[PDB]
UniProtKB/Swiss-Prot annotation:
The gene is gag-pol. The chain holds residues 1 to 87 of 1603 of the full protein. This is Matrix protein p19. It comes from the Viruses. It is found in: Virion.
């Protein structure tokens, strides 16, 4: 909502680098992860046990609707966290 955008922006930069997303990207993806009912708060990203219902949905709408405007962001924000919760 304001902090998470940065709390995760620093992680993706250390797990991806320049390839990482942007404050504009994540910010938009978040609003979508809250409207779809997939998340109740921006801090929900700290729940690695909810990435399942959040990864299948995004990949489902993209494969079906034909647009991964939010997937490209999820995959990135995930590729970083997944590594942060492994060490």
């Amino acid at each position: 909502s304001e902090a998470v955008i940065k709390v995760i922006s620093s992680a993706c930069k250390t797990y991806c680098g320049k390839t990482s997303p942007s404050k504009k990207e994540i910010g938009a993806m978040l609003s979508l992860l809250q409207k779809e009912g997939l998340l109740m708060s921006p801090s929900d990203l700290y729940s690695p046990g909810s990435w399942d219902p959040i990864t299948a949905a995004l990949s489902q709408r993209a494969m079906i609707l034909g647009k991964s405007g939010e997937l490209k962001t999820w995959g990135l924000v995930l590729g970083a966290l997944k590594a942060a919760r492994e060490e």
